[PDB]
Design an enzyme around this catalytic site. Sequence first.
Site, PDB file in Angstrom:
ATOM      1  N   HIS A  19     -33.869 -31.715  28.122  1.00  0.00           N
ATOM      2  CA  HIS A  19     -33.980 -30.493  27.343  1.00  0.00           C
ATOM      3  C   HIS A  19     -32.699 -30.183  26.565  1.00  0.00           C
ATOM      4  O   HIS A  19     -32.737 -29.385  25.655  1.00  0.00           O
ATOM      5  CB  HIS A  19     -34.456 -29.328  28.187  1.00  0.00           C
ATOM      6  N   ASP A  43     -36.950 -34.380  33.532  1.00  0.00           N
ATOM      7  CA  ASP A  43     -35.976 -33.817  32.583  1.00  0.00           C
ATOM      8  C   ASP A  43     -34.680 -34.629  32.558  1.00  0.00           C
ATOM      9  O   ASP A  43     -33.629 -34.143  32.901  1.00  0.00           O
ATOM     10  CB  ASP A  43     -35.718 -32.370  32.958  1.00  0.00           C
ATOM     11  N   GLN A  83     -26.971 -21.217  32.943  1.00  0.00           N
ATOM     12  CA  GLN A  83     -27.022 -21.653  31.551  1.00  0.00           C
ATOM     13  C   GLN A  83     -25.719 -22.240  31.091  1.00  0.00           C
ATOM     14  O   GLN A  83     -24.651 -21.725  31.321  1.00  0.00           O
ATOM     15  CB  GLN A  83     -27.373 -20.438  30.660  1.00  0.00           C
ATOM     16  N   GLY A  84     -25.833 -23.389  30.440  1.00  0.00           N
ATOM     17  CA  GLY A  84     -24.707 -24.172  30.038  1.00  0.00           C
ATOM     18  C   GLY A  84     -24.293 -25.295  30.971  1.00  0.00           C
ATOM     19  O   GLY A  84     -23.531 -26.172  30.583  1.00  0.00           O
ATOM     20  N   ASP A  85     -24.829 -25.237  32.185  1.00  0.00           N
ATOM     21  CA  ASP A  85     -24.642 -26.294  33.177  1.00  0.00           C
ATOM     22  C   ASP A  85     -25.646 -27.423  33.109  1.00  0.00           C
ATOM     23  O   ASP A  85     -25.464 -28.459  33.735  1.00  0.00           O
ATOM     24  CB  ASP A  85     -24.636 -25.708  34.612  1.00  0.00           C
ATOM     25  N   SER A  86     -26.741 -27.207  32.371  1.00  0.00           N
ATOM     26  CA  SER A  86     -27.797 -28.185  32.312  1.00  0.00           C
ATOM     27  C   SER A  86     -27.279 -29.584  31.948  1.00  0.00           C
ATOM     28  O   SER A  86     -26.399 -29.738  31.102  1.00  0.00           O
ATOM     29  CB  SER A  86     -28.864 -27.788  31.314  1.00  0.00           C
TER      30      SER A  86
END
Length: 224
Positions: A41, A84, A177-180
């Site tokens: 993603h 993912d 969020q931002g760690d993905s």
Amino acid sequence: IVGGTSASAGDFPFIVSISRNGGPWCGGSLLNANTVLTAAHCVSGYAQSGFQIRAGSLSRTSGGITSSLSSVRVHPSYSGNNNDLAILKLSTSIPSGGNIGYARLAASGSDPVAGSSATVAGWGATSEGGSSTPVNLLKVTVPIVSRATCRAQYGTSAITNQMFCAGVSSGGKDSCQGDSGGPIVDSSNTLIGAVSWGNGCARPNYSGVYASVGALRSFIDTYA
């Protein structure tokens, strides 16, 4: 990372930060000199020219070695939150040495055991909905949550055999969020997954959900 502490130099020799349009975006793991593993993603369908990887630094903005992307390959069964993972090929090869090294991957077919300790790292938000992101890498240790308990939280169909969960029942420690795309490792620092999704960040009774390297190893080995 919510509830985390600063990483030290060399804690994660393989970690990379992934910026997009010059701002923070995702994390990833260096597999070899020209290959990064991240979440699908983070990259699927976006202009590839917008991305830059940085290796070899605790900072997402300075230091280390940078590269643009040459290609992107998403798992062939990526759909919704499932499967993912993506493989990125780098325009500039990145040699191991110093604080850079390549990830050791979980064995094909393995699945992390409930109650075992896992450590996740990244440059994402430090609160749910947070607007400011740290410059330096943070990490947090959380236990693996059984798939059955994770299915009780999210629904039976929501958690597939290519996902695993990790978190604390009372909340307070999680990826955000931002760690993905960044790494979750076992207590030996073997790469077991990539940050994928969850219901908010660090909420009680909502585990973080991770894409499983053990489950998706055939894809990685084919294209790395």
